[PDB]
Design an enzyme around this catalytic site. Structure first.
Site, PDB file in Angstrom:
ATOM      1  N   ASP C 189       0.845  -1.186   0.000  1.00  0.00           N
ATOM      2  CA  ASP C 189       0.000   0.000   0.000  1.00  0.00           C
ATOM      3  C   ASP C 189       0.882   1.237   0.000  1.00  0.00           C
ATOM      4  O   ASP C 189       1.544   1.538   0.999  1.00  0.00           O
ATOM      5  CB  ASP C 189      -0.917  -0.010   1.233  1.00  0.00           C
ATOM      6  N   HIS C 191      -0.251   4.253  -0.255  1.00  0.00           N
ATOM      7  CA  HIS C 191      -0.977   5.212   0.585  1.00  0.00           C
ATOM      8  C   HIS C 191      -1.060   6.623   0.014  1.00  0.00           C
ATOM      9  O   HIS C 191      -0.997   7.608   0.768  1.00  0.00           O
ATOM     10  CB  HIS C 191      -0.389   5.250   1.999  1.00  0.00           C
ATOM     11  N   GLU C 216      -1.307  -0.960  -4.201  1.00  0.00           N
ATOM     12  CA  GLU C 216      -2.469  -0.172  -3.824  1.00  0.00           C
ATOM     13  C   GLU C 216      -2.200   1.325  -3.747  1.00  0.00           C
ATOM     14  O   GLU C 216      -1.226   1.788  -3.148  1.00  0.00           O
ATOM     15  CB  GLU C 216      -3.017  -0.664  -2.470  1.00  0.00           C
ATOM     16  N   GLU C 242     -10.231   3.153  -2.767  1.00  0.00           N
ATOM     17  CA  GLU C 242     -10.657   3.348  -1.393  1.00  0.00           C
ATOM     18  C   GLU C 242     -11.144   4.770  -1.127  1.00  0.00           C
ATOM     19  O   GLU C 242     -11.997   4.976  -0.258  1.00  0.00           O
ATOM     20  CB  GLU C 242      -9.576   2.960  -0.408  1.00  0.00           C
ATOM     21  N   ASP C 265     -14.813   1.033   0.092  1.00  0.00           N
ATOM     22  CA  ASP C 265     -15.028   0.747   1.515  1.00  0.00           C
ATOM     23  C   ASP C 265     -16.504   0.879   1.822  1.00  0.00           C
ATOM     24  O   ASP C 265     -17.124   1.901   1.537  1.00  0.00           O
ATOM     25  CB  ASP C 265     -14.192   1.694   2.361  1.00  0.00           C
ATOM     26  N   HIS C 292     -11.714  -2.226   0.885  1.00  0.00           N
ATOM     27  CA  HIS C 292     -10.920  -1.514   1.880  1.00  0.00           C
ATOM     28  C   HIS C 292     -11.622  -1.653   3.225  1.00  0.00           C
ATOM     29  O   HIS C 292     -12.819  -1.437   3.341  1.00  0.00           O
ATOM     30  CB  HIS C 292     -10.811  -0.048   1.447  1.00  0.00           C
TER      31      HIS C 292
END
Ligand SMILES: [Cl-]
Ligand SMILES: [Cl-]
Ligand SMILES: [Cl-]
Ligand SMILES: [Cl-]
Ligand SMILES: [Cl-]
Ligand SMILES: [Cl-]
Ligand SMILES: [Cl-]
Ligand SMILES: [Cl-]
Lengths: 395, 395, 395, 395
Positions: C189, C191, C216, C242, C265, C292
């Site tokens: 991830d 981020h 991700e 996400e 999510d 997510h």
């Protein structure tokens, strides 16, 4: 002459059922056709009965006129089962027309553009390299094959880490190249078992350095546009199309640059009438044709004539009439054998090609009606694999 | 509970055959479904028998699990006939699941998002305006209809100059607006009889000033991209999709902006399982859904539940159980009548809407098995029109 | 039945606050939902109070009817905070409806299409390979995890030369493959900390040879089109989504081919009502779903039902109820632990899957209202990193 | 100087609540801002409290530094409520910075590029032409307005045939042109109530011959691409954007040619920091800006400075501080009046323009804190209209 009877034979081709169709005329001729085996073959006779209502009393030499009538009467685009039946009836009409004119069918298709038809052997499994070598060499010794198709899958793709699945395929192809004759051509059929375009691209690029003859049908067929995405950045020859039905599905595939080679099936798309249109589209897009053909010896004969007449034809899938029964995938050379007998004198390979029969009208084969009567329907279905979480994946 | 029997009823809906399917469970429940009538309905029982092999012993509340299994086992995308059978089995599974939970089917689809379901009357012909007025008014008096669908064609489109054909349609629509109630909505179904996108656009733009509720299916279905070309510069609402089968055909149609309104048929696409996916795609593209439904009262009940649960549903095609037999086009109100009896208590319109039956589980109708046994198969086929040169055109 | 009360619990999930919502009916049922923790959780109760005005007195089995009402009443597309509250209320409605029908929620979503739900462990840091091995092995021994997610970042990306940052990530992944079990799946991830598409592509291609399960969210979310540019020429599986909120943001992402796997999510997008639409769109584009889920045990239960019913679901993010507190990135296994207690009987993994609870209606968990009353709000905020020149970069 | 206090006032603007924000510094200055009223205004104070944690102790003259920090700390793109709060804080920072430098805010935005700011009167209903004339003339006599905005809707759009709905709008606009002063400009706000792009195009083209100043927001906001489809073949000026939040949503709108004029709201998008970026993008695409502004007198003052500094600004929405209360649509001039008092000395129009206050620093208005304390929160919500079938449509 006029069409005056249809005869439908529910028979079999080893462990798959097969519906074979005859159309008879009032001049005493008969034309023959082979339906694809989608699954529920007992649906085919009632479809054929219904379609025959549009053919009774008609001039069979009006081939496209009648085949288009069969297509139009449904209004909806015919699907798998309907087009399988239409395919066999198309074959019968070409055969009748050629017999009426006393010519091989290819003379009704613009003539022969080649003298013989290259075939590859449908092996379909993923045997270890020494066993693959021995089987390839056996096939070469007997029939002259130098092209073969295997499965790339060496493990259950849903039960192992994806990088390891792909590495197993690449290591397998490397082994094959280290082991078998340098001149042998090897194609891989991924059998529509990959969901994601990126995953299909990763596998294709892992096979690419070892020169796959083609990489067949990695993804599912319903989304045609994604095939163009797959092929962008793909380093090997991509083949697909066996699961597409008509000129327009193939047009879309070609427009998105979704294949380098197309694989329509002459028992699936509606016969020669549609196959020729499809091949013509591919030709203008500089895409070749490698017909899909896991079907039987009559289907093979139909393919011989189409392939002989089609400039952009490259190679034809071939299963021996006496030989391996149904299989896809697995670590073995398939043990189950069978014998398909409904054609008296099937086309057999010589030096890895099927040879034309220029002195014989029609398909150039005789049918064995007694054999068809002796061997009837058999139930056959596909296994849909499951993932470890219990979900179904893709056949 | 587990599925433990399938019962297949070959019956009829006026002058078209109809296959009705029951799935029974070992807890004593039964779910019901209706197959589309593509043509050769005698093909449906063998398809259903084959599919049932994948359902026997299974938990019917795993609806999508089982319907997807039926789709995947064919590998090839199922066509018309296969999907018709799958549709009926999908219906049976929703009905069983709803009966098991003691709820109306719409409670399994996210709940009702409306209280009643607007319908239009399938009239289908092109009667002179005074006769159209009288029939519309009769339908309004009896059932509250204020929306109606006609054919636009006032002459044989292949036997008259095209400008005159289009002018006849425009003059006809003008007459209707001069004659019938101002609030009445009038849709036109061109029934896939136009070959050229430009011609379809010309007709649509000639109808446009008189506010067609929608202009349905002018072109053939196989080339989806051309629908986007048609709609560019089209001034009326364009509806199509009845002849498309799956989420991906509809996705392509939406991507090319080939329709303002889509018309999938819940007996054609594979039932609610597929219909919901299709409608969801359309919703995100800001396209509404007007389901195609010339089928019978069980199909209508299935449509009521889907339509009640679907935000972007707009209006539902409706044929009365006792009323007009099969027709498309022509200068008359159809004289042939019939009575469809296999549903005991069909949904009937009130003020031009079908009303929900919230206190009844499943579809909210009872089946009449004796009526199905009394009225069997009847042969039905489409007429494919011809041009004056003897060629076949389009049904 | 009618909704007749809402109860809102300000509690916590280790070191992040958490708002948990109950909707009660006049038949004595209660449905439960979990809001995402965007940051200012004290904003959620007043949003919920306002939304409840549209739910009071309504039939909770009209799930989409009511959720769409909540969406439409704002007119403007709801953002993060509004949709978080809507998500929890959607969850409550599904739970109520399932309890009313006495079924698990998945039976309201088309049924279970798998028997268990694969999870990966949210580890989130970048520990040296031996420490990573030990933690992976511990997690495997306890819970059967064989899939894990880490941060790729081994240094401050703004304080070192970019080529060295990327090399550190590639060398790290190589080390992990040299050290940990061959079958382990490892996702990274990033981020949303990379600004430039080209830089994101360089990092992804550096990780690619070691088979990341997925890569991700490398880039920021606001420009969706640039994700299509990133993915062109990217050799690994790309996951994002996400930070996207609705069917149309996901449609755009899919249209530009901006992801191979999407990660909505269920506490962010508006609950199951929206999650299902999103997943359906992805399915038609041949894109899978990996939800997510850094949220708590009620959110996890909601995910179990959605995931069980969704064909294109692949794997679910999972944090243990008793375990590691909040972290992203860094050279250590996070030392801070916590215990989340508001669900009595959370779903725990067995062999790396969550198992369904078919005999229990609703989500299949019980709530601990005393625990929620005992543990209240806690302040939590993100650190936005800075560059050496004093500017702020991206969380 | 450093920010050392925030004061939040829950007040009202006639019948809508309004949150007004002050930021104070340790040099004794105060800057003021206005939040949009999305609905649940009681959510705003807790959001503001959370955001203030990032502003405490900071230099307010670092406007973009701090506003970007507020955006980045959420990681997820902030939505409606979060951005409303951010907007007010942005306003406070510009006001503080301008007061610190002893200049009008426009001097911090590149300077004034015009001397006065054209406004149109927000009338919002659809009164019969004589009543419209009288109201326009009253507004012209008092304030010099020569531009006005109405609703186009003369009937319930879901309860009448669409062609008649559109004809009613066209006939209405024709009547207005036959009745009111020839120089008057008349815009129509369709208020996001049309689902289908084709329907929006039909209405726009029906209004077009009478020269709408602009045709505002006919469709819903979530699908941006469909706006490009709408505008193809549209003959009038199309305005939208009020429901879009950031530079990237506007970039997409511009890229698809989905508007001729954009209408961001300075209380919705994150204040001047974001508004300027949006306007700059529009400028390069040769698209003008007509800010959305149904908010109060402080929001109006913020708009005056932005508009004065922005080359591609065209006209500003304006509601009188003492005048008509909330309304959209309907056959009357709204009877309900109110008085908004939280600004001592609001900008009032002269000859239909707002005039700059060059000798006054900051926004150039004084706040009435006693009035804000006297008039508190009031509940306000939108009505979502229903169709005759009981479904909800669009606010
Ligand atoms: Cl050889
Ligand atoms: Cl042999
Ligand atoms: Cl009426
Ligand atoms: Cl009647
Ligand atoms: Cl293990
Ligand atoms: Cl643990
Ligand atoms: Cl004036
Ligand atoms: Cl006034």
């Amino acid at each position: 002459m006029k069409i005056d009877r249809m005869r439908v034979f529910m028979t079999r081709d080893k462990d798959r059922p097969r519906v074979i169709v005859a159309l008879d005329t009032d001049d005493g001729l008969t034309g023959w056709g082979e339906c694809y085996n989608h699954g529920p073959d007992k649906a085919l006779p009632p479809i054929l009965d219904y379609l025959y209502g549009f053919l009774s009393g008609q001039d069979p030499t009006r081939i496209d006129y009648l085949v288009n009538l069969l297509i139009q009467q449904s209004r909806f685009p015919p699907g798998a089962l309907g087009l399988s039946a239409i395919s066999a009836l198309d074959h019968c009409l070409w055969d009748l027309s050629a017999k009426a004119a006393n010519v091989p069918v290819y003379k009704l298709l613009g003539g022969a553009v080649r003298d013989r038809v290259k075939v590859y052997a449908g092996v379909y499994t993923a045997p270890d390299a020494p066993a693959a070598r021995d089987e390839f060499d056996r096939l070469n010794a007997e029939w002259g094959f130098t092209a073969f198709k295997l499965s790339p899958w060496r493990v259950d793709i849903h039960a192992h880490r994806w990088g390891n699945v792909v590495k197993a395929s690449a290591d397998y192809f490397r082994s094959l190249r280290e082991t078998v004759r340098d001149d042998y051509e090897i194609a891989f059929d991924a059998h529509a078992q990959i969901f994601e375009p990126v995953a299909a691209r990763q596998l294709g690029n892992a096979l690419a350095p070892y020169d796959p003859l083609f990489y067949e049908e990695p993804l599912r067929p319903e989304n045609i546009d994604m095939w163009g995405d797959l092929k962008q950045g793909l380093n090997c020859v991509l083949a697909t199309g066996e699961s597409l039905y008509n000129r327009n599905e193939f047009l879309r595939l070609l427009q998105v640059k979704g294949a380098d080679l197309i694989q329509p099936d002459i028992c699936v798309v509606g016969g020669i009438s549609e196959m020729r249109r499809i091949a013509t589209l591919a030709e203008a897009y500089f895409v070749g044709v490698a017909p899909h053909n896991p079907m039987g010896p009559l289907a093979t004969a139909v393919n011989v004539h189409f392939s002989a007449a089609t400039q952009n034809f490259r190679i034809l899938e071939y299963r021996l009439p006496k030989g391996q029964a149904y299989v896809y995938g697995g670590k073995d050379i398939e043990k189950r054998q069978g014998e398909t007998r409904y054609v008296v004198d099937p086309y057999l390979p010589k030096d890895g090609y099927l040879e034309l029969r220029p002195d014989r009208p029609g398909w150039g084969v005789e049918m064995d009606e007694k054999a068809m009567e002796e061997e009837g329907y058999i139930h056959w279905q596909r296994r849909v694999p499951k993932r470890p979480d219990g979900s179904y994946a893709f056949a």
